[PDB]
Symmetry: none
Subunit: 154 residues, 4 copies
Amino acid sequence: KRVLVAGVGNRLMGDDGFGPRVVDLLSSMSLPDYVDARDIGTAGITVATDLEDYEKVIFLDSVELEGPPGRLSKSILEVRGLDEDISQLARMTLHEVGLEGLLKFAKSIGVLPGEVTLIGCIPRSLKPSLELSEEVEAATHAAVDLVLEALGLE
Amino acid sequence: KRVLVAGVGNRLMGDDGFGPRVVDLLSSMSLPDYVDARDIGTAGITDLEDYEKVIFLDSVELEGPPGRLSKSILEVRGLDEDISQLARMTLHEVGLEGLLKFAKSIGVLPGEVTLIGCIPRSLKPSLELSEEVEAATHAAVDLVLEALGLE
Amino acid sequence: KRVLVAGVGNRLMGDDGFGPRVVDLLSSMSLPDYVDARDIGTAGITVATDLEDYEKVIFLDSVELEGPPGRLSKSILEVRGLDEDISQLARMTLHEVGLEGLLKFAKSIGVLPGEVTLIGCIPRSLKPSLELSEEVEAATHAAVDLVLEALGL
Amino acid sequence: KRVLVAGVGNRLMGDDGFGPRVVDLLSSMSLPDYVDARDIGTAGITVATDLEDYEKVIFLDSVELEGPPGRLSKSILEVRGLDEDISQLARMTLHEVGLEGLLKFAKSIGVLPGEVTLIGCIPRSLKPSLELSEEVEAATHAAVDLVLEALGLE
């Protein structure tokens, strides 16, 4: 309960099980107790009283990015920058209808972990299937190393 | 109508009249015709697609001394990428549809927005500005002119 | 409907939500049938066919004074003394305070309720936000105490 | 230019000349330079650039109250209290007592000096006349004493 490693996707949809299958591998290792490797599947995660509790989160999923199957892409969401942008938007939206909806937005983001990292895998196929392609199965192991090296555990 | 200079605030709430009172100064001045200074008071700008750059003058709650100005830049494209990241995260409270509707509604804003805000001395109901924010009006005109490049 | 408790302010503006939030707490209590706890927000209230029905009126709002963030100021507006003061102003023949305006002013306030009570909360933050600070959140229950105390309940 | 003693009324209307006639008495005594005894008549006085430059004001006029001609009546307008009542009204969000006009009204009241005293005289007659009744003439001398006592000059 300090770092969250979240695998996101449908294990019944072929290479969309990439994220969860990286969680299966991480569960087999001896990570420190502050790491929670969690398969959230397609059910999503509640920010209040769950995601709030982590200092740091790494999200793993499958992405429609151009390139070959199994290619990994690492990116960051700078959450502090996002709060500031929303605040600027608010100041222009103070007297419009959807200001409220914007502040509901901000309240959830304001408590997101200060470090948010996303690791995406290009699938080979997303059709119904219990199995990974070979490329995405190889990518699960490459993604462990990315996760371990983002945590300083390599 | 290429550039919008928008004064925002309630002229009856003392130093919240900062923005409109910056518009009053600029409105009298012999500015280029493509610039449209507008006191939108408390109406909220709604129209807005017609401009290419927007400069925003409001009063804002910051910690420093009264009459202090904050210039900041909102880069709407950067907000776009951040929204796509949030989509991938499947937060229960940040639902996919609202996220996309949010992205749609800001996509029509100009590419670059400037926000000049003013630390007020008092927002108590009043027709007048405090002395600081009074002085900060002219200070803020120079920011507008330099942001517009004219001075 | 013969006593009004009006919460005034913008729920969207952090601690400006003080008043409405106090009405929220009172709305979920077992108040007598005559009390009307109304969330006025930022719309104001018409005096004719609305404010005149109440012989007693309590207002809750956020007001920036010299004091600790979250403190309640309770003040009283005596419509009658204001009338007598307006008569003194008439006698003075101030250029900027013309007689016909003083008279219209007297007539407009004359239909207000006899006693009017105002509970202001010193806020901590008014930047756009759906929440109250801890101080103002605690002040809302404090204000609930003062409202029932001023009602006799 | 510190204390204003203001006589208010119409010298051509009999005992409505009480106030200006008290000013006549004061102007012929030897009063400190800081006292302005001013015959306002029926012309009124401007607050900005005039009344606001005094710290203490005494108004003299004619008032119909219960009581015999020449009876005097001293009252106080508590102006700082009156500001507060206007703020309380401004906080109230009454549709029929708007905010801008209320703020204009408060702009005047906000600069009146905190020390405001009113001395009224019950007339005998307000019929057209250059002269005061016996009673109100005698009341001018009594009002002079009230003025001098109020100022510490008795």
